[PDB]
Amino acid sequence: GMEVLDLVTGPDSVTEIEAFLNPRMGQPPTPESLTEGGQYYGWSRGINLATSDTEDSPGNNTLPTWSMAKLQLPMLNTLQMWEAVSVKTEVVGSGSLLDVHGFNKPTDTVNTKGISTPVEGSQYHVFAVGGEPLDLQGLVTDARTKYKEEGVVTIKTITKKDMVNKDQVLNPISKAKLDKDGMYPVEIWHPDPAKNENTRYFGNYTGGTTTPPVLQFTNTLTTVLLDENGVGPLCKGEGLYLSCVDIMGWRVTRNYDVHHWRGLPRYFKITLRKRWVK
Amino acid sequence: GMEVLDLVTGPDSVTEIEAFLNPRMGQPPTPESLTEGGQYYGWSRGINLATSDTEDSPGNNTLPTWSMAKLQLPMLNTCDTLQMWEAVSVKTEVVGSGSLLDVHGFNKPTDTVNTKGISTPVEGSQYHVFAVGGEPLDLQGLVTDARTKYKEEGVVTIKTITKKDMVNKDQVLNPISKAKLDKDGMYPVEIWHPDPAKNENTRYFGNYTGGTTTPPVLQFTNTLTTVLLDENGVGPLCKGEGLYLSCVDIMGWRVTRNYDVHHWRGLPRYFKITLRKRWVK
Amino acid sequence: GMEVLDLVTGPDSVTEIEAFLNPRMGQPPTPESLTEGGQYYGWSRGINLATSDTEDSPGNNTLPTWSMAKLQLPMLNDTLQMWEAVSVKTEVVGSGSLLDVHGFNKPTDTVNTKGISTPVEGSQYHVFAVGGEPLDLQGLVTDARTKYKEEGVVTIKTITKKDMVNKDQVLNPISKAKLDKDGMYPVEIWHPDPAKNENTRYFGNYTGGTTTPPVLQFTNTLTTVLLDENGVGPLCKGEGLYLSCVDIMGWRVTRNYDVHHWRGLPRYFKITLRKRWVK
Amino acid sequence: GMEVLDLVTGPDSVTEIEAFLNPRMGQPPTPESLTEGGQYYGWSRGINLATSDTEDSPGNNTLPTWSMAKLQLPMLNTLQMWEAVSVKTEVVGSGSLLDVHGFNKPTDTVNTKGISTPVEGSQYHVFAVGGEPLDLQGLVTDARTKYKEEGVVTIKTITKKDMVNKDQVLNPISKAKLDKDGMYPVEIWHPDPAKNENTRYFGNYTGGTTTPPVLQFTNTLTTVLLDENGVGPLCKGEGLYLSCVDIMGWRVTRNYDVHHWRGLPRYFKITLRKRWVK
Amino acid sequence: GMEVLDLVTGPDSVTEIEAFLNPRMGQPPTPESLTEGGQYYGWSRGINLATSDTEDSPGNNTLPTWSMAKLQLPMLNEDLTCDTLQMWEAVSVKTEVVGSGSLLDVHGFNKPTDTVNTKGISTPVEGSQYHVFAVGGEPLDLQGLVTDARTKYKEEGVVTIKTITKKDMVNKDQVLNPISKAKLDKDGMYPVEIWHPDPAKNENTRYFGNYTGGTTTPPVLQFTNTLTTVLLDENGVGPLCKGEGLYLSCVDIMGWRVTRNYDVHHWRGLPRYFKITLRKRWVK
Ligand SMILES: CC(=O)N[C@H]1[C@H](O[C@@H]2[C@H](O)[C@@H](O)[C@H](O)O[C@@H]2CO)O[C@H](CO)[C@H](O)[C@@H]1O[C@@H]1O[C@H](CO)[C@H](O)[C@H](O[C@]2(C(=O)O)C[C@H](O)[C@@H](NC(C)=O)[C@H]([C@H](O)[C@H](O)CO)O2)[C@H]1O
Ligand SMILES: CC(=O)N[C@H]1[C@H](O[C@@H]2[C@H](O)[C@@H](O)[C@H](O)O[C@@H]2CO)O[C@H](CO)[C@H](O)[C@@H]1O[C@@H]1O[C@H](CO)[C@H](O)[C@H](O[C@]2(C(=O)O)C[C@H](O)[C@@H](NC(C)=O)[C@H]([C@H](O)[C@H](O)CO)O2)[C@H]1O
Ligand SMILES: CC(=O)N[C@H]1[C@H](O[C@@H]2[C@H](O)[C@@H](O)[C@H](O)O[C@@H]2CO)O[C@H](CO)[C@H](O)[C@@H]1O[C@@H]1O[C@H](CO)[C@H](O)[C@H](O[C@]2(C(=O)O)C[C@H](O)[C@@H](NC(C)=O)[C@H]([C@H](O)[C@H](O)CO)O2)[C@H]1O
Ligand SMILES: CC(=O)N[C@H]1[C@H](O[C@@H]2[C@H](O)[C@@H](O)[C@H](O)O[C@@H]2CO)O[C@H](CO)[C@H](O)[C@@H]1O[C@@H]1O[C@H](CO)[C@H](O)[C@H](O[C@]2(C(=O)O)C[C@H](O)[C@@H](NC(C)=O)[C@H]([C@H](O)[C@H](O)CO)O2)[C@H]1O
Ligand SMILES: CC(=O)N[C@H]1[C@H](O[C@@H]2[C@H](O)[C@@H](O)[C@H](O)O[C@@H]2CO)O[C@H](CO)[C@H](O)[C@@H]1O[C@@H]1O[C@H](CO)[C@H](O)[C@H](O[C@]2(C(=O)O)C[C@H](O)[C@@H](NC(C)=O)[C@H]([C@H](O)[C@H](O)CO)O2)[C@H]1O
């Protein structure tokens, strides 16, 4: 699989596959009930704050995590491998943020009037396509943060030891692979630029508290995945890995300004071709 | 035909058609009377808010919906090889942003201490989408709140399609919740989004900018052409000579002097589409 | 001028002309006196507000209007010649003047009446057009009930001889005009008509809000090509060249009841034209 | 130098020259003393306001003016002229705006705490390179403004008459040339688009009062000065004119919100070549 | 070293080297203890303000400084007297600021957004941002320029204009004073509010910078592994590594966090990754 040779031609030598990845903002897909917690699906549960400089214990369901899927491609086997050539990707549903008729904190709080404040604030959009899991590099705001041990994969899960001060900057010890959906918090785990030779990733961040969310969408834009040498990600064991996170901001409730993260689903249409290798 | 062959040449092989789609912000075109509701045409009616976490029922006339039109093209159709109209390009323009420079009206004023200043111009969340295709725009439903009590008359919602109430998956991507944009002023834009899993025969282009007092921004020129050809050089092909135009152009809200009532503002969109005849098999 | 043929060659087959159009924000150029109203030239007079939901009567001098000029080109004439507008270099001049924050506007510290004189801010509108005939206009208003003056401005009612209808708040094809007079057509009413203007190129942008920072760029190195997809620029009917524009920078605000005055800036045009054979 | 002919080849036919222009925000370079006014060098003195609608008398040291320099090129004389082909220009010192530890108006005025508010507000960046002085067109906010007669060059300096109402728009009578450093106020004098055939200028303006200042800087960007015919500015009598202004905004003091303009220096590196002319 | 000739071909004629530079916002990497000050690593200590117009004495640990590293490349010339030599040439760099996602932590103990009830969210990092990186074949040349020539910077612990000149700053140091120059030859020592890339030098370095000001400005960052910055000049020549030394320099300030105690601000910085492609170049 090391030496990359000619493209393979002939029947079924090119394929397209599509997938959507639902966001993982904190509330899991179940319970489905719209009274017992399912009404928060697509959102986090209410963000809970530290009680002191030394007591920061966020709930698992308040922490957005990476979405990921591993897709199995047609069996193939000088061997052949599937090569990801390009991707059309789209974040769906920004129009739903035009709902300003709900029960959020209103724009006129004196009289409880105006409109229901739309989703605003910090936004984070990353997607990746690769032929193996996305390589992750840990880096946190606060190495003292007391993440739960169960239900979430954090730096301590990997090292078996408490975070160190270097984890607030770049600590090469704190690395992982995005091998599970809805488990790796995005406030901890970042694409690792020192690895990911077989993955392309693309991200942006906009911060603030009331920042207007911005999003574009079209079915006419293709992201090429080929590297400088004309070679796309090569799918080891015919596995294709898709990873993303799409945070639009928070809604704010009428009770103590409780914030809920809002995420939106991402569509992928990947074009792949067979490549000779040895 | 599924197989796309050569361009047709000769007399009348290329045509240009134009249309404007008026916005559908909530108030219908009629009554025309400027005292009986017609004064809100181009706008929504006053946005009504939920009364609790479990009671959110927006008025239909408070919900912007998609604009659409189906235009009939000239009839077409050895008779073993057929012809279809192919949409090559579109010049499209949102008209009327200058009208937002009216700051002399009776909106909430900028100085509420003296009730002075200027009439606050339209501001806030903005949403601009257009599409051109050879069949209706494919729609994917996704809502803020699956508990929202959308009206069961006068509007097409997820429940219209499924015959069942919305579920938690409708707040993310639920592949069951799909529709086609086959009616003007009927599909709310807060529910129905272009479906990237379909629309093989339509090109769509959209953007969203949120917030409450965000300055609206717009550009307009008659010098810009959008090419509609795909990677293979093939534009949307008009099934049964029908051309579908879809759009929505929300500029923000105006706010009244009475308990900050908000009204959505929309603007009309112009389309000039160039089509050519294409041989198909 | 139906069929467009070869370019004309030879002596004086290419020409260049320049003009500036001063803004039309509401105060006319006269009286010139700086105590009798001339001090507002380049600005509107104080924006006056509706007194009810059914009583909106703006003063003519509070409404920015389109600037326009028709320039006469050198006389030319089966096969005739027309002047063809090839490109334009255009610039909005004087943004540096907005750096005057030492005047008597509403100050930045209203608590103590201190700080600086608040600079021009808010809603901005920049459009220019170059064509071989008047700019085609499409009417569209915020409020079809607005009571524009009958004299002194050209409005929808001027054209139709009838009151505005609700369709005038969206696209009503009946409500059309031509930009044939300077300082007469309000920009909150009259927009470039995308369904016409085959022989004019226009370019516009809008940024709204109340305190939005104005933005402007300027350079003498930027050329706007006016040729269409077929390589044909606007053709000047009867050797007339039409220039149209509006350049609103925002408002200044006074210390008296937050009265707003629109601010506009002049626009420079330098048009390159060439002779074109036509049949 | 009427007709422009071929490029001159051979030894020393191409030259590079560099210069920095310090900003002229209102306080002159002297006195140097940091207690006698020198502490304001790089800044204006405190902006003074009109006392009524008819009494606007700005101090000279509150008005930013154009920076300019005339550089002498190697002597040359079918004659030859120096042709400016390109310029690399940069505004230096934006990092200094990261000083938020001084005694400006603080971010928390309720308690007088936080940080020293950094420079913010209206920004103005223009540079020009030409073979003769930059041509200026006058245009003011207020034709009634009572500028000082001595110490600044204003419209009245040129016309010998008071400003007229047309000076608030485009009045072709009100023209000048940028022939002195630190003398022509930028709120009065603008690049004249009806002239400047032998100069290239590039400008932008961003307004507001608390607007975040933005600046990019790199040594990898070249501005080509050649016109549509491949001809750059031709230096009359071997003189090269550099003109600029780089306003970053204002700092605000803790005393009645007094504002001081902040300017930054601009670097220029001009490439010139010999040109045959007739 | 001066005259640039053909590219060298053959085995190991092209190489790639990578490095990360951690931010230098004010708190040093040690002590490591999360109770003794290590909890501030990645941040400045609390910004302290002037007490009058003539008394501005910032603490060293409140001043972000330039990050830098010198990488030693494989030696090329056994004999420097040969009429033709080889040098490493930096062709391009992939660079990335890592960890912006960590700013999505709004669950800590910063000043909260609901100050009436002490609720809402922990206010995220906001405000003034500064991103510069450089790659060159010798130290980055620095030009001094300060807000206030009266600022009483410590004499020990930071390299300032006075460190270089041995004299107090002059009023000209508030604009361009060509006397006030230095080289970025040490990590975590040169304050970024004092020292700027010198556009009059740096012939053998490429630098790229941007500044965004304000106090509550939303921070913005992009990251991808698909973006290459080309380092070749107008003649097709990249930085040439003098004595095989490659210099990397950067600063990446994201803004401040604000505490619940007197709105004390702490600068936040993020690390920067570099992957530099270099090739051997014949020179004489
Ligand atoms: C219901 C509750 O209080 N849950 C606590 C939880 O308390 C458990 C148990 O449920 C409770 O009966 C018992 O008295 O105490 C035990 C143990 O303490 O304790 C956990 C910590 O272990 C949490 O503190 C939890 O509180 C929830 O925490 C979530 C974050 O993990 C989140 O903040 C919840 O906030 C929301 C929510 O997302 O559910 C915010 C939301 O806006 C609210 N919705 C509305 C319409 O107001 C809801 C709502 O108040 C509650 O869900 C109850 O209907 O809370 C927070 O409750
Ligand atoms: C007129 C009214 O009260 N309408 C109610 C409606 O009341 C019905 C019935 O129509 C009415 O004649 C009767 O008195 O009572 C019954 C039942 O109570 O009930 C419906 C059902 O939900 C609505 O509540 C309706 O209220 C209107 O709802 C609209 C949204 O669907 C919108 O919010 C209307 O608000 C506006 C408007 O857009 O018309 C907002 C606008 O800014 C206002 N304009 C001005 C100049 O003030 C108008 C204005 O108050 C009224 O239209 C004048 O009657 O209302 C809202 O009225
Ligand atoms: C002076 C006045 O109030 N004028 C009215 C006008 O009244 C006329 C006549 O002029 C007056 O002497 C008489 O008492 O009444 C008659 C008829 O009623 O009536 C018209 C309507 O037909 C207007 O209401 C007009 O008021 C002016 O309207 C302008 C817009 O059309 C504008 O708002 C004027 O406001 C300014 C101005 O732009 O001139 C705002 C400006 O900021 C002010 N300048 C300063 C330094 O304060 C001036 C200034 O107050 C006045 O011009 C007095 O010198 O007013 C508005 O006055
Ligand atoms: C010192 C003073 O009052 N200067 C006046 C000047 O007064 C002269 C003379 O100096 C004075 O002793 C005498 O009593 O009166 C005469 C003439 O009346 O008069 C001129 C007009 O001719 C000015 O009004 C001047 O005031 C200064 O004007 C500057 C603008 O030209 C500027 O606003 C000055 O404001 C600053 C400054 O820039 O120097 C603003 C600055 O933020 C302040 N610094 C601090 C740390 O507070 C300083 C400071 O207050 C003074 O410099 C005193 O050291 O003032 C303004 O003073
Ligand atoms: C602790 C203190 O006051 N330190 C002073 C320092 O005082 C030393 C000595 O530590 C102290 O015991 C004694 O009273 O006096 C000596 C000598 O005077 O004096 C220096 C000046 O020489 C400083 O004034 C220092 O104060 C610290 O200054 C830092 C900037 O250099 C910074 O502002 C510190 O502020 C923080 C911090 O960054 O550590 C801000 C931070 O948000 C705070 N964290 C929390 C959770 O509140 C901490 C915290 O209050 C202190 O570290 C104590 O735990 O302070 C500032 O303290």
Residue numbers in the entry:
A (entry chain E), D (entry chain C): 33 to 109, 116 to 316
B (entry chain A): 33 to 109, 113 to 316
C (entry chain B): 33 to 109, 115 to 316
E (entry chain D): 33 to 316
Paper text:
Murine Polyomavirus (MuPyV) is a double-stranded DNA virus that can induce tumors in newborn animals. Viral attachment is mediated by the major capsid protein, VP1, which forms pentameric capsomers that assemble into the T = 7d icosahedral capsid of the virus. Sialylated oligosaccharide receptors are engaged in a shallow groove on top of VP1 formed by loop structures on the protein surface, similar to other polyomaviruses. The differences among the three strains have been mapped to amino acid variations at two positions, 91 and 296, within the receptor-binding region of VP1.
We solved structures of VP1 bound to the glycan portions of two of these gangliosides: The GD1a glycan is an established infectious receptor and essentially a truncated version of GT1a lacking the [α-2,8]-linked Neu5Acb in the long arm. The previously identified MuPyV receptor GD1a is similar to a truncated GT1a structure, containing only a Neu5Aca-[α-2,3]-Gala motif instead of Neu5Acb-[α-2,8]-Neu5Aca-[α-2,3]-Gal. The disaccharide engages all three strains in a very similar manner. Neither the longer E91 side chain (in PTA and LID) nor the shorter A296 side chain (in LID) result in an altered conformation of the ligand. GD1a binds less well to all strains compared to GT1a. In addition, there are differences in binding strength among the three strains. PTA and LID VP1 appear to bind GD1a at the same level and better compared with RA because these two strains gain additional interaction surface and van-der-Waals contacts from their E91 side chain. We found the main difference between RA and PTA/LID to be a differing affinity for GD1a, which appears to bind better to the latter strains due to the larger E91 side chain. This might facilitate attachment and productive infection by these strains to cells that display GD1a, and may thus give them an advantage over RA.
